[PDB]
Structure formats: C-alpha cells, structure tokens
Amino acid sequence: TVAEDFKTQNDFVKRMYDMILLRSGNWELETTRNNDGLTPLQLAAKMGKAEILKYILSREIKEKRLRSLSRKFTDWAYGPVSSSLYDLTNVDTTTDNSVLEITVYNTNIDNRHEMLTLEPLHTLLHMKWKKFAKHMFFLSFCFYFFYNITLTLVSYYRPRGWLQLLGRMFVLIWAMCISVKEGIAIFLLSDAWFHFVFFIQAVLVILSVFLYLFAYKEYLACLVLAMALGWANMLYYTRGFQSMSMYSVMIQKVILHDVLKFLFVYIVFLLGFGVALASLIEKCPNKDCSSYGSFSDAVLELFKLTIGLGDLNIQQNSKYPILFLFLLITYVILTFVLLLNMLIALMGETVENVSKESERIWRLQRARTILEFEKMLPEWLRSRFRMGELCKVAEDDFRLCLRINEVKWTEWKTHVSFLNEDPG
Amino acid sequence: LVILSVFLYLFAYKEYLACLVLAMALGWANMLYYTRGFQSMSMYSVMIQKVILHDVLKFLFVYIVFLLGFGVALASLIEKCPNKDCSSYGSFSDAVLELFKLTIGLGDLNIQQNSKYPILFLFLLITYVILTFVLLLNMLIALMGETVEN
Amino acid sequence: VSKESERIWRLQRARTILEFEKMLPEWLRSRFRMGELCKVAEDDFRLCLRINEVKWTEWKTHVSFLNEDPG
Ligand SMILES: COc1ncnc(OC)c1C(=O)Nc1nc(C(F)(F)F)c(-c2ccnc(C(C)(C)C#N)c2)s1
C-alpha cells in the first residue's frame, strides 16, 4: 500500500518485501486476503504499484531451502542462452479475479501502459493473442465489414426478396444481436465509448428497418445515418496493425482533443459574424439582390467563405459598405488565424507524445479485446486453449508455468540453479 | 509500354495513343531514379518518394473509403427530378465527382439538392468535408512530425 | 508555447484574484481572511497557513514541532 514509485522512494519497500517474505518462509503471507478479498499480489495489481508488481511476478530465490517461494525458475541455462520458467498460479485469468484481468480491467490507475509490459503479463497477452484472439478479432472485422457493405448496398438500392429479404433479414439479425451484446456490455459499470456508438448504430439500423416495415417513410434518414455511423465505427477495427493502429488513434486524438474546441470557437465566430452581417444588411426593394439576407443565409455564405466557395462582393446592399467589408475581412482573417492555431496545436504538441500514446492505446485496447474474447468462449474450448504448461519445481508443486527463452552476453555466472540438468 | 504503343501504331489497332502518353508520363516519373543521384536532388527526390510511399497512400485509401461511403449516402438521399439535372448529385459517379471537387475546393454547396431531408443531407455533406479536412490535418502531422526527425 | 501560456495565465489569475480582493468590503474580506492562528513563541500568535506534505527521501528523528500530538 505504501510503495509509490522509484523516483520518490529509492525502492526500499521492495527490499523490505523480500526480507520479510523470505524470513517467514512459506506462502502464509501471500495467500491471505484482506477484508476486500485481495491478496498482496492482487492488491499491488489493484493499485498501480508497478515496481512491487514487477518484483512479485518475477521473483527468483536461489537459496535451496527457500527456492520453492520463487515465481521464476531459470531451469535450462547453458551459456548466454537461458530459459526462465515463469509462474502462472494466479495470473492466467483462470481464477475469479486474476492479476491479469485486474491489470487490464482496472481503468482507475492510469499506469497500465507500463504494467502490461511486465514479465509474464506481456508474453501471456501475446500468446493468448496469437493463439485465438487474432483469429476471433479478424473474424469480427470481416463480419462487420460485410455487414457494412450490405448496409451500403441496401442504402444505394433503396426502393427509389432477392435484395430485400436476404440483406434486410441479415442486417436485422446482426444488428439486434450486436445491440444486445453492446447493451449488456454497458451494464458493467477515448477508451470504451465504442460500446456506446456500436449500440447506437445497431439500434439505428433496427429502428430504420422496423419503420420501413411500418407505416412511416421517415426510415431512410435513420438508415443512411446508420450507414455513415457504421463506416465511422470501422475506426474501432482499424486499431489492429501498427500502421492502422497509429493512424486510427492519432485521427481519434485530433478529432476529440483539438478540432472539437476549434469547431466550438469557430461556431461562436459564425454566430457573432452572422448576426453582425445580417444586422448590417438593408432590405432590397429585389430582395435577392444581396446574398446575406436572413440570418441562416449569412451563416451559409460565411461557411462557404471559410471553405472557399462564397463570393466577396462589396455591394451587399449595405448602409456602411466600408464597415461591412471590414467585418467580413475580420471574420475571414480570424478564422484563418484559428486554422493556423489549430495547425500549431496539432503539429507541435501531440507530435512529441503521439508515438507513445498510440502504442499505449493500441496495447490497452488489445488487452481489453483479448480478455473479452477470452470470456466469449465456453469452458471446454477455453480449457482447450489453456496458455501455459506444467512444471515440477518443489517436492510436489507442479504449478503452471510459461517458458521464456532469452539471451544475455553481459552477466556471466556459473549456473547453480535449474530444473533440467540437460538443456532441451 | 513504349514498344507496345509504337508496335500498335504500326499494327492495325489505333488505340495506341493511350499507351504512348501513359508511357511518356511513366518515363517522366522514372526520372526520379536519376534525380536521386546528386546530393540536393538525392534528399529532395527521396523525401518526396518516402512521402509518396509511406503516407499519402494510406491517406488515399482511407479517403477513398470516405468518398465511397459518402457517395452512396448522398446518392441514396437524392430524389429524382421530373429536369433530372436539377441536382448535381445524381447518379453515384456524379456524386463522387462533386465530392472530389469539394475536397479540392471546386464543388458547389447548394442546400437545394432535391433532398427529402435537406438538413440531414447538409449534415452528411458537412461531415464529409470536415472529416476529409481532418484527414488532411492528420496527414500533415504524420509527415511534419515523424519523418522530420530521421 | 506550453510554458509561456501557463506563465501568462498564472500572472493573469494572480492579478484577477488580487483585483477581486480589493473589490470586496472590509467586513467580507475579514470574513474570508485566509490563514489561521498559531502559537510558536512565548507569545507570538501570528497568522499561519498549514501545508501538509509527504517526503520519503530524507529520514530524520523529528526534534522540533508545535503540537507533539499530530492532529
Ligand atoms: C471512416 O469513416 C467513414 N468511412 C466511410 N463512409 C463514411 O460516411 C458515410 C465514414 C464516416 O465518417 N461516417 C461518420 N458518421 C458520423 C456521425 F454523423 F454519425 F457523427 C461522423 C462524425 C460526425 C461529427 N464528428 C465526428 C468525430 C470528429 C467525433 C469523429 N470521428 C464523426 S462520421
């Protein structure tokens, strides 16, 4: 509980941990749980104590009589090569609250970008991934892409059972099941709003098709909005590979961080300059003789001017043409300045930490997806996957383990401890 | 390409100009291999080439997906005109053309596209132009912060 | 930009706070009266402003304090 971080403590608490642990030599201390139902390992997992965690997960005790207390046994070393045999007793998500499911599902610590790089956690995520999660995730991407192309074709070929029944029933069933899935996912408590938006798009599709079946011709709006939103939601599934991961997540960073506040201030610009210009206008005796007519007209022209399609004509039937021209030049200049300010905000600030934030968000979303798929599978298939092996380390321990080969040329040591004398 | 074009010119197939002009363009592009010899030209040519291959291509893919989705959306929002040319977003390819011109800044924003829900159509169009603007900004950061180091 | 923005904002906030400080009457200002009382000397009882802190680096046998019983 009191272990904070090396920069503020010099990490004596890890030393005292080792001392007190191997002094009372047994699993008495690590096995008890507190009134929150957590063990010291699970506890350091619940909080964000990375140092204590990195110690407990990979703790090697090389003394003979206390070797059974370790959670990493170099069992195979021959030279600069070696095969550390980590432990997966309460880390492998096969318990109520594992260290891994805690480290991934605890979003109120804000340090996981480091904790999910620890000794067995990182490679266990990697192994679960390459075993089943890559396959299930790519399958989900393919199903969603086909559902999206079917929404697109249904939208294009709206009525101005070949095209109607097949596609409409398929989108109905897919949308209803994914909506129930996302909704029950909401009921658990830029990280996980994709549940919100997926559920919203699915309900949009289902409402659109139900209204199409019903006596309401206002279904096309819902349908086309659902299509544009599903194509937006493809952003979730383009988190996968390194290029698309970085691309999608920095697009998200732009969209949410900066362009939104830029849009807010620009809409304030629009409101103010629109009311000003429409207040400067004079009614034409040929009212269409000046495009800045009603308020909404002026706002439209100002929009087009920002994008570069409006027209600058000094004869807007003004009463003070110089002042009106001044206000209009002011608006275009200031929105130009807001464009420049946005450019600097996204070209100087994020560019430093974009590489790191992209990677940490990629990693956290991969952890969440892997652990979610892990639940989506039945007990028998999960036991059929069962990352890790068996390994004898004590008189009779035979606790699960996870081999990790390694190579280190720096620290040469006469090997003294191993499980197998002969390297396999 | 050049040899096939000139052979077809000699042959009895007068659809050769396509091959010939495309070959001239491809050669003027292959001038890159020779303008990556001199030092200033080496740096210039190869940072152009790294832009082209690294980033504008993925930008083009995602922007093509933008175009396709927004084109089918807009063309599914349109209503037939009884003066069918009374709305530029007519057939699909027409809508894609206008959306391209909007991205380069040549299209026309007229709210009266013979829509049935003009507010929603205008919303989708503003969404497309804003999102392709955002893709331009994202591309700009990807080529102005990352590559500039190495 | 990151540093200049914060320094100019901090200057502005200080100016606004001290501004408002004067905009209020004497009675209300005395009703605010940041700080508390505290006895340090034989009879000092000057104003003071508590600040809790946490430092794990420098361990020292504490020798000086006003209230031996920590509250
Ligand atoms: C890759 O995306 C696509 N691929 C192919 N076709 C497409 O459109 C048909 C699309 C697409 O962008 N769809 C969209 N729908 C909507 C909505 F109106 F629901 F909000 C979009 C929207 C609107 C406003 N602010 C955002 C932010 C900035 C938060 C983001 N992000 C997103 S975007």
Establish if B64 touches chain A: CB-CB under 8 angstroms: no
CA A41/CA A246 separation, integer angstroms: 33
Nearest to A8 among C1, C2, C56 (CB): C56
CA B66/CA B70 separation, integer angstroms: 6
Among A198, A252, A255, smallest CA distance to B130 is for: A255
**Phi, then psi, of A165 in degrees rounded to 5:** -70, -55
Q: Which atom of ligand 1 is nearest to the CA of A252?
A: 31
**Spatial contact of B77 and B88, defined as CB atoms under 8 Å apart:** no
CA B114/CA B88 separation, integer angstroms: 9
Own/partner contacts of C7-12, CB < 8 Å, gap of 24 or more, are none
**Spatial contact of A139 and A78, defined as CB atoms under 8 Å apart:** no
Sequence-distant (6+) residues with CB within 8 A of B84 are: B90
Nearest to A9 among C1, C2, C56 (CB): C56
Beta bridge partners of A379: none
The CA distances from residue A12 to A30, A51, A60, A70, in Å, are: 19, 11, 18, 20
Terminal alpha carbon distance of chain B? 36
Residues at CB less than 6 angstroms from ligand 1: A 228-229, 231-232, 234-235, 255; B 65-66, 69-70, 73, 127, 131
Establish if C59 touches chain A: CB-CB under 8 angstroms: no
Q: Which atom of ligand 1 is nearest to the CA of B123?
A: 18
- CA of residue B141 relative to chain centroid, distance: 20
CA A124/CA A121 separation, integer angstroms: 5
CA B102/CA B123 separation, integer angstroms: 15
Burial class (CB in 10 A: 0-12, 13-18, 19+), A252: middle
Q: Which atom of ligand 1 is nearest to the CA of B69?
A: 6
CA A306/CA A266 separation, integer angstroms: 10
Among B106, B109, B122, B125, smallest CA distance to A304 is for: B109
Burial class (CB in 10 A: 0-12, 13-18, 19+), A105: middle
- Which string of DSSP letters, residue by residue, matches A164-218? THHHHHHHHHHHHHHHHHHHHHHTT---STHHHHHHHHHHHHHHHHHHHHTT-S-
**Spatial contact of A400 and A89, defined as CB atoms under 8 Å apart:** yes
Look up tokens 């004869």; give the residue: A315
CA C23/CA C17 separation, integer angstroms: 10
Sequence-distant (6+) residues with CB within 8 A of A52 are: A3, A13, A14, A17, A44
Sequence-distant (6+) residues with CB within 8 A of A424 are: A76
* Torsion angle in degrees (nearest 10) through CA of A299, A302, A304, A305: 180
Nearest to B72 among A156, A342, A355 (CB): A156
Q: Which of C56, C57, C58 to substitute to test the interface with A, most A CBs within 10 Å?
A: C56
CA B32/CA A125 separation, integer angstroms: 45
Beta bridge partners of C36: C48
Tell me which method was used to determine the 3D structure.
cryo-EM
Which value in Å is the resolution of this experimental model? 3.6
- The angle that helices B118-141 and A242-253 make with each other, rounded to 10 degrees, is 120
CA A33/CA A147 separation, integer angstroms: 47
Beta bridge partners of A407: A81
**Phi, then psi, of C48 in degrees rounded to 5:** -155, 170
Is beta strand A72-74 parallel, antiparallel or unpaired with respect to A81-87? antiparallel
Q: Which of A229, A233, A258 to mutate to test the pocket of ligand 1 (most atoms within 8 A of CB)?
A: A229
Cα A70 to middle of ligand 1, angstroms? 52
Token pair of B135, please? Answer: 């893709």
Chain C residue at shortest CA distance from A350: C2
Token pair of A255, please? Answer: 């969209």
Establish if A145 touches chain B: CB-CB under 8 angstroms: no
Is beta strand C36-38 parallel, antiparallel or unpaired with respect to A401-407? unpaired
Q: Which of A148, A266, A307 to substitute to test the interface with B, most B CBs within 10 Å?
A: A307
